[PDB]
From Swiss-Prot, chain B:
Part of the U5 snRNP complex. Component of the U4/U6-U5 tri-snRNP complex composed of the U4, U6 and U5 snRNAs and at least PRPF3, PRPF4, PRPF6, PRPF8, PRPF31, SNRNP200, TXNL4A, SNRNP40, DDX23, CD2BP2, PPIH, SNU13, EFTUD2, SART1 and USP39. Component of the U5.U4atac/U6atac snRNP complexes in U12-dependent spliceosomes. Within the minor spliceosome, which acts on U12-type introns, interacts with PPIL2 and RBM48. Core component of U2-type precatalytic, catalytic and postcatalytic spliceosomal complexes. Found in a mRNA splicing-dependent exon junction complex (EJC) with SRRM1. This is Pre-mRNA-processing-splicing factor 8. It is linked to Retinitis pigmentosa 13: A retinal dystrophy belonging to the group of pigmentary retinopathies. Retinitis pigmentosa is characterized by retinal pigment deposits visible on fundus examination and primary loss of rod photoreceptor cells followed by secondary loss of cone photoreceptors. Patients typically have night vision blindness and loss of midperipheral visual field. As their condition progresses, they lose their far peripheral visual field and eventually central vision as well. Signal peptide: none annotated. Widely expressed. The chain holds residues 57 to 501 of 2335 of the full protein. It comes from the Eukaryota. It comes from Homo sapiens.
Curated annotation (Swiss-Prot), chain C:
Methylated on arginine residues by PRMT5 and PRMT7; probable asymmetric dimethylation which is required for assembly and biogenesis of snRNPs. It comes from the Eukaryota. This is Small nuclear ribonucleoprotein Sm D3. Core component of the spliceosomal U1, U2, U4 and U5 small nuclear ribonucleoproteins (snRNPs), the building blocks of the spliceosome. Most spliceosomal snRNPs contain a common set of Sm proteins, SNRPB, SNRPD1, SNRPD2, SNRPD3, SNRPE, SNRPF and SNRPG that assemble in a heptameric protein ring on the Sm site of the small nuclear RNA to form the core snRNP. Component of the U1 snRNP. The U1 snRNP is composed of the U1 snRNA and the 7 core Sm proteins SNRPB, SNRPD1, SNRPD2, SNRPD3, SNRPE, SNRPF and SNRPG, and at least three U1 snRNP-specific proteins SNRNP70/U1-70K, SNRPA/U1-A and SNRPC/U1-C. Transmembrane segments: none annotated. The modification N-acetylserine is found at S1. One of its GO terms (molecular function) is histone pre-mRNA DCP binding.
From Swiss-Prot, chain D:
Residues 2-74 form the Sm domain. It comes from Homo sapiens. Keywords: Cytoplasm, mRNA processing, mRNA splicing, Nucleus, Ribonucleoprotein, RNA-binding, Spliceosome. Plays a role in pre-mRNA splicing as a core component of the spliceosomal U1, U2, U4 and U5 small nuclear ribonucleoproteins (snRNPs), the building blocks of the spliceosome. Component of both the pre-catalytic spliceosome B complex and activated spliceosome C complexes. As a component of the minor spliceosome, involved in the splicing of U12-type introns in pre-mRNAs. As part of the U7 snRNP it is involved in histone 3'-end processing. Pfam families: LSM (PF01423). InterPro entries: Lsm7/SmG-like (IPR044641), LSM_dom_sf (IPR010920), Sm (IPR047575), Sm_dom_euk/arc (IPR001163), Sm_G (IPR034098). GO terms for biological process: 7-methylguanosine cap hypermethylation; mRNA splicing, via spliceosome; RNA splicing; spliceosomal complex assembly; spliceosomal snRNP assembly; U2-type prespliceosome assembly. This is Small nuclear ribonucleoprotein G. GO terms for cellular component: catalytic step 2 spliceosome; cytosol; methylosome; nucleoplasm; nucleus; P granule; precatalytic spliceosome; small nuclear ribonucleoprotein complex. CDD domains: Sm_G.
UniProtKB/Swiss-Prot annotation, chain F:
Methylated by PRMT5. Core component of the spliceosomal U1, U2, U4 and U5 small nuclear ribonucleoproteins (snRNPs), the building blocks of the spliceosome. Most spliceosomal snRNPs contain a common set of Sm proteins, SNRPB, SNRPD1, SNRPD2, SNRPD3, SNRPE, SNRPF and SNRPG that assemble in a heptameric protein ring on the Sm site of the small nuclear RNA to form the core snRNP. Component of the U1 snRNP. The U1 snRNP is composed of the U1 snRNA and the 7 core Sm proteins SNRPB, SNRPD1, SNRPD2, SNRPD3, SNRPE, SNRPF and SNRPG, and at least three U1 snRNP-specific proteins SNRNP70/U1-70K, SNRPA/U1-A and SNRPC/U1-C. Residues 1-70 form the Sm domain. This is Small nuclear ribonucleoprotein-associated proteins B and B'. It comes from Homo sapiens (Human).
Length: 534, 445, 84, 74, 97, 71
RNA sequence: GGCCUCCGAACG
RNA sequence: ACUCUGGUUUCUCUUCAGAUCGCAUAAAUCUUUCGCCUUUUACUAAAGAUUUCCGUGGAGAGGAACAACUCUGAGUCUUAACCCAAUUUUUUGAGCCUUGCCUUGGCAAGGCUA
């Protein structure tokens, strides 16, 4: 046996109903999806480990091992990234009080793996970036910013390991606000420096960036800090608070008097005092001040722990303290829905720049497909291996229609066209699969507007192939494939040692090429099989 | 319940009448045949009794046979903490200071046998007077004083707030200054820096990868041909796979094929490899105990704003009227800079496994209180040939024990050595390494 | 600081809901926004008067104190708010 | 608390204001307070007989408003 | 025509000079070198030929003693030193040119 | 003091009486200080109609009584 | 640019 | 702010631990490959499956030692200075008339108010 990884066969989560969450994501428009990458190997999975850790009741303790589910890719993910990106979805509440359905797919940091991460990013209508506070923006952030700018997809700046980079380097608050302000100046400078409109408006007050730390797993933002500080005292200030939260201002003795210009002797900036002051002091309350100041700061912050829990160790008490203070997810969903567009509003330009034929009967078929239902048109994403290596499930985007179990669908190929489709063939959907953390939910019929996995399409599915209704629906089926934004360089020709292994090498090359659409398997004129990758 | 008998009565009486033989031990003959018939009692007892040079003390309770045949000493290793590892390593630092001094060395050696007639009863004089030797560590700037009181002990903390609070060993606990002075005295001995990629691509999964691919490294252990027998090749297969005229750039770097299992296609069977890069983090080194909390590393911010951009809504009315500070605007009043060794604790945030563990649980001081192997991993050229190959031999034993793994299967029961006291067998008592060890020597004779 | 039914009212934002004021007019449609005082801003409303006549109105916003009750979809009855 | 209702989407928009007792007025919203008092420009009262009269800019108390309705797309 | 792989590298000054010596050993003509701020972390992007870029990361991290974390990608193209079809080009199979 | 008076009646079937004479019956899952009623599978009496999940405001409520055990 | 298998005791 | 609930270390016995590593973890047996070899024990160094030592972990039960130290979930957990309510409840405005239905009682609808 010894299957590589188990993506299914897990228990349910806490405060999550399959009825309410499934029909809620497949019914209203509050559902959305995105993928957060940014810099390569900047602790992207750690975010999904924090969200899934706050969702499911059983989560791996950070002290024992990584919070991610065990037996995932084995040394592939254990060494770094590995998975060319896998989809996941969960229901995350928001700071406004209303929950939401968010599908987040972690992305690898490797070059070609980032190209496949963009190929998978062509499905969702939005993307977030993971930028470590230490290294700032990496090459994967620049290339991902160029590919995301060319894709016209909304991106959300997300800072990772903020308290880890500032705590390990012992950065002062002035160099923390100035350094982070320089990183945001480079993010907005590259976004506005890319092309088209400057309306992105990347900034902490605009809610485009979220300051988080993977060491203590503390996710915060402007509205999150204003909601926590206002929740403690002065809850009447919410919008006017976060708007005046940082900016350039000082806190003047008049009670609140915020100085826009001049030092006014108060502080170098308002975000340093009112933001970095309770932040860095919370991290400083541990370590040397951990045992000493625990009753004073813990009693002042209202947090409490058991005698054995508080005496556990430095880092477990730090992640547990951040869980007892900033552990509530606020800026992620609040800053998400405020950034990520709705399904229709983000779908219309996406369907305009995605499918070939637009306008009537095609974009109109997709426009009418958005809210109520589609006329059975499935524009996928990709296909990954199942729990067994025999078959492979197709994890893809559904543009229109409610996929029914066993219902036929017309799936075209790459070179196939709407006028004449040679590769178009009907197929039945065995079972629907929704990927949530380490498990998956099988459904018979999944309505339109959700990216899910299905079975029954293996051989006719090659790379990215959209499915259409068996009725012969016209007007631009088989949506255009995603561009990897890279050129094939490395060519590795593999030949079987035994001559009888030729069919195993051909079939293994077909299934391997379908498992990694980024690579290109081309048979040489001399008869050898050569591979091409970035 | 088993109670401790008088040591001089059972010890002196048993061992006194035991070796006399004649008609007193005539019935004890077979009992002595059982004593000599049991090897592991004296081996595990003597090896289990290790007062160590780091302290000066006596040994522990032991069960001496009611017939005077032999005894056994059951003592758990009871490894204390990295402060204890810093007590042994501190004895190594002070031992190095004594090595630099004393221009005229000592003799030592001298196995005082001279054939054999030391049937020494002088243990009574060992009870009379005491050497009061070893120890000799006075170093502390009013810091390690609690660890100085815990420097030499069989049970470092008898009873306290943070402690094991057991008979011998239990879950460890300590305070912040114990970690401070622990990293101080431990920092005086051999200490490891941050891991990052320096600790990788060398041993553990890397060594298992080198042994799997059966290829040498820039120095290190060596294993075997493994699955490969002698030679397997073909004239048509070599001409198809390779080429007489091909591209030549680099001379096939072995390190490139090591970390890349796709680069070397020869015998990719049962290989644990492909650990990609590292986190590539940066740990700020310590400095003199001065202020401020920021070490002022090179930064040079890009001219701060320099006419870049600003926020929105710069209206003073909505600003001063946007908040009502009815409570304290900051979290709490404090000085989170130098307060309570915030620099020493901040440096303690990144610490090795023994130091970063804070309060410990248990460890074996008779098995692995040695960090020297990892310190010897990837040794520079500062050592001679024989020392380099010897380091490759130490890494060869560590790589053998590492690659051996373990089948942690089930076991029957423990305590069976101590469970032999259920019926009448022996009687324990508090004894010393000279008294109990000398009794084991008489049990050998 | 916010009641559980009010939090459910926040969770129900974005679904087709039915509202009846203190004067008896029935308003059914999607709920755009909901406040702590039960101010409801809605879209695509089909009005039912006390006489039975109906009409179509694009945008309405109702005072919180003037609402007799609200009708929410059954999708919210399972969780998160179920507690013993 | 003291959260003012958000009319910022209805600002400078023609409104249809239903009042208790069969009273109906229409006009443009010039602002609001936390007490739901409305400043309505060009307010026209709808009589029960169907006749219209322009009463000008007026203040409308939030107590008596059953529902406020917008006649434009916001 | 072949692409030119650019590799951004993170390392101290000594490992940056050693990285320049490695690129010189591979005859790579780099991109730029800068003392990356926010922490004294030297970051140097490198323009390099794709043919000589094999094993650049392995030998880079190996020569840096567990440092100099870098990443490469295809950038632009190289026009090659000269035109093919030369009668005197053939010298020896093992000897590089 | 105990405050369980409203906490006892959770999940029970409750017959509600309004100020205008209407009668609401539904599974009572929640309340608040404002007397906001949460009625699952609620019905209206005056004539019976199917309501479903209904959130009733506390200003129009008069009295309540236990209809029966939870379904 | 480095890699250093070695390693004996009885009986007979 | 009242009351019922009522705790810590050590020593044994019985189960479970193909475990996220029982952190720096030893030895033996057999099927073979190999090393040198004049036969054996020992022995050179790799694979596999069969195991033991030093340990060690979880649960339950039985003991002593300061135990009278304190925790515990809940139980109706009965308080006066001063200024205030125009969207949720103790400073907040309802009634009358007429018609139809119901055995009446009563219910539904419309109108009237100032």
């Amino acid at each position: 046996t010894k299957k590589f990884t188990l993506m299914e066969q897990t228990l349910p989560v806490t405060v999550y109903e399959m009825d309410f969450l499934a029909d809620l994501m497949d019914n209203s428009e509050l559902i959305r999806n995105v993928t957060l990458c940014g810099h390569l190997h900047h602790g992207k999975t750690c975010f999904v480990d924090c969200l899934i850790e706050q969702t499911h009741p059983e989560i791996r303790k950070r002290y024992d091992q990584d919070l991610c589910y065990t037996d995932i890719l084995f040394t592939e993910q254990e060494r770094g990234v590995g998975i060319k990106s896998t989809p996941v979805t969960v229901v995350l509440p928001d700071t406004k009080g209303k929950s939401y359905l968010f599908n987040i797919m972690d992305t690898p940091g490797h070059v070609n793996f980032s190209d496949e991460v963009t190929a998978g990013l062509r499905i969702s209508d939005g993307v977030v970036l993971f930028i470590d506070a230490a290294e700032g923006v990496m090459l994967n952030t620049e290339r991902l910013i160029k590919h995301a700018v060319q894709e016209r997809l909304a991106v959300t700046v997300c800072i990772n390991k903020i308290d880890r980079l500032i705590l390990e380097l012992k950065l002062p608050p002035t160099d923390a606000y100035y350094k982070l302000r320089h990183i945001v100046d480079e993010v907005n400078g590259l976004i506005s420096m890319y092309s088209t409109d400057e309306n992105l408006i990347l900034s902490p007050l605009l809610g485009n960036v979220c300051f988080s730390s993977s060491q203590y797993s503390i996710c915060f933002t402007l509205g999150s800090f204003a909601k926590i500080y206002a929740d403690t005292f002065g809850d009447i200030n919410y919008q006017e608070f976060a708007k005046r939260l940082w900016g350039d201002i000082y806190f003047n003795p008049k009670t609140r008097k915020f100085t826009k210009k001049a030092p006014t002797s108060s502080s170098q900036r308002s975000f340093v005092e009112f933001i970095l002051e309770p932040l860095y002091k919370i991290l400083a309350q541990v370590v040397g001040d951990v045992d000493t100041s625990l009753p004073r700061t813990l009693d002042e912050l209202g947090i409490h722990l058991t005698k054995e829990e508080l005496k556990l160790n430095i880092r477990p008490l730090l992640r547990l303290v951040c869980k007892k203070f900033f552990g509530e997810f606020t800026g992620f969903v609040d800053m998400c829905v405020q950034h990520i567009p709705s399904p229709k509003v983000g779908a219309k330009p996406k369907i305009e720049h995605t499918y070939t034929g637009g306008v009537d009967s095609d974009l109109g078929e997709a426009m009418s497909d958005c809210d109520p239902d589609g006329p059975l048109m499935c524009h996928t994403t990709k296909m990954y291996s199942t729990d067994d290596g025999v078959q492979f499930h197709a994890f893809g985007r559904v543009l229109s229609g409610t996929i029914h179990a066993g219902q036929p669908v017309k799936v075209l190929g790459e070179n196939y066209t709407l006028e004449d489709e040679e590769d178009s063939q009907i197929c039945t959907v065995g079972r629907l699969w929704i990927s949530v953390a380490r498990y998956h939910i099988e459904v018979n019929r999944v309505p339109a507007g959700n990216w899910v996995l299905i079975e029954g399409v293996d051989q006719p599915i090659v790379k990215t192939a959209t499915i259409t209704e068996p009725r012969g629906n016209e007007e631009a089926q088989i949506f255009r494939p995603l561009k990897f934004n890279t050129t094939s360089v490395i060519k590795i020709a593999v030949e079987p040692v035994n001559p009888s292994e030729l069919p195993k090498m051909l079939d293994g090359l077909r299934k391997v090429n379908k498992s990694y659409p980024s690579l290109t398997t081309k048979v040489e004129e001399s008869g050898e099989h050569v591979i091409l990758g970035t | 319940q088993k109670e401790d008998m008088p040591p001089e009565h059972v010890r002196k009486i048993i061992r006194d009448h035991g070796d006399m033989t004649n008609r007193k031990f005539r019935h004890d003959k077979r009992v002595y045949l059982g004593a000599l018939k049991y090897m592991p009692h004296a081996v595990l007892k003597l090896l289990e009794n290790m007062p160590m040079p780091w302290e000066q003390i006596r040994d522990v309770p032991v069960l001496y046979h009611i017939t005077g045949a032999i005894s056994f000493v059951n003592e758990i290793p009871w490894v204390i903490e990295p402060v204890y590892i810093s007590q042994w390593g501190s004895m190594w630092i002070m031992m190095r200071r004594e090595k630099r001094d004393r221009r005229h060395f000592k003799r030592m050696r001298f196995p005082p046998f001279d054939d054999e007639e030391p049937p020494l009863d002088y243990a009574d004089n060992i009870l009379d007077v005491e050497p009061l030797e070893a120890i000799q560590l006075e170093l502390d700037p009013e810091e390690d004083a609690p660890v100085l009181d815990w420097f030499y002990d069989h049970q470092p903390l008898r009873d306290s707030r943070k402690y094991v609070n057991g008979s011998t060993y239990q879950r460890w606990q300590f305070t912040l200054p114990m970690m401070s002075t622990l990293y101080r005295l431990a920092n005086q001995l051999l200490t490891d820096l941050v891991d990052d990629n320096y600790f990788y691509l060398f041993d553990l999964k890397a060594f298992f990868t080198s042994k799997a691919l059966n290829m040498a490294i820039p120095g290190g252990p060596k294993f075997e041909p493994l699955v490969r027998d002698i030679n397997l090749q073909d004239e048509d297969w070599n001409e198809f796979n390779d080429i007489n005229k091909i591209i030549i750039r680099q001379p096939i770097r072995t390190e490139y094929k090591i970390a890349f299992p796709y680069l070397y296609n020869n015998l990719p069977h049962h290989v644990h490899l492909t650990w990609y890069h590292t986190p590539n983090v940066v740990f700020i080194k310590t400095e003199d105990p001065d202020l401020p909390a920021f070490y002022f590393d090179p930064l040079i911010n890009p001219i701060s704003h320099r006419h870049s951009v600003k926020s929105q809504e710069p209206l003073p009315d909505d600003d001063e009227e946007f908040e009502l500070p009815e409570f304290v605007e900051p979290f709490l009043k404090d000085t989170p800079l130098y307060t309570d060794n915030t620099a020493n604790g901040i440096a303690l945030l990144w610490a090795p496994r023994p130091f970063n563990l804070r309060s410990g649980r248990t460890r074996r001081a008779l098995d692995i209180p040695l960090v020297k192997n990892w310190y010897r991993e990837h040794c520079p050229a500062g050592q001679p040939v024989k020392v380099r190959v010897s380091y490759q031999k130490l890494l060869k034993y560590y790589v053998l024990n590492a690659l051996k793994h373990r089948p942690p299967k089930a076991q029957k029961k423990r305590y069976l050595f101590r469970s032999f006291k259920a019926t009448k067998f022996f009687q324990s008592t508090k004894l010393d390494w000279v008294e109990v060890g000398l009794q084991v020597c008489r049990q050998g004779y | 600081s916010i009641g559980v039914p009010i939090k459910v009212l926040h969770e129900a934002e974005g679904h087709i809901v039915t509202c009846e004021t203190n004067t008896g007019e029935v308003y059914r449609g999607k709920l755009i926004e909901a406040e702590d005082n039960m101010n409801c801003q809605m879209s695509n409303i089909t009005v039912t008067y006390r006489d039975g006549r109906v009409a179509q109105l694009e945008q309405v916003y109702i005072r919180g104190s003037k609402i007799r009750f609200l009708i929410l979809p059954d999708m919210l009855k399972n969780a998160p708010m179920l507690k013993s | 608390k003291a959260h003012p209702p958000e009319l910022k989407k209805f600002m400078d928009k023609k409104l249809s204001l239903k009042l208790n007792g069969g009273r109906h007025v229409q006009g443009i919203l010039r602002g609001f307070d936390p007490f739901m008092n409305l400043v309505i420009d060009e307010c026209v009262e709808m009589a029960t007989s169907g006749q219209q009269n322009n009463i000008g800019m007026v203040v409308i108390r939030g107590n008596s408003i059953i529902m406020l309705e917008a006649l434009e797309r916001v | 025509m072949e692409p030119y792989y650019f590799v951004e590298v993170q390392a101290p000054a000594d490992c940056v000079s050693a990285v320049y010596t490695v690129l010189a050993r591979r005859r790579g003509h780099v991109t730029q070198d800068a003392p990356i701020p926010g922490s004294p972390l030297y970051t140097i992007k490198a323009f390099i030929p794709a043919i000589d870029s094999f094993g650049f990361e392995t030998d880079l991290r190996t020569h840096t003693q567990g440092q100099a974390f870098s990443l490469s990608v295809f950038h632009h193209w190289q026009i090659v030193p000269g035109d093919p079809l030369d009668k005197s080009i053939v010298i020896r199979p093992l000897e590089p040119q | 003091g105990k405050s369980s008076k409203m906490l006892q009646h959770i999940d029970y079937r409750m017959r509600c009486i309004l100020q205008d004479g209407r009668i609401f019956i539904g599974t009572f899952k929640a309340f608040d200080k404002h007397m906001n009623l949460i009625l699952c599978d609620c019905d209206e009496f005056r004539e019976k109609r199917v309501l479903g999940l209904v959130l009733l405001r506390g200003e129009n409520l008069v009295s309540m009584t236990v209809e029966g055990p939870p379904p």
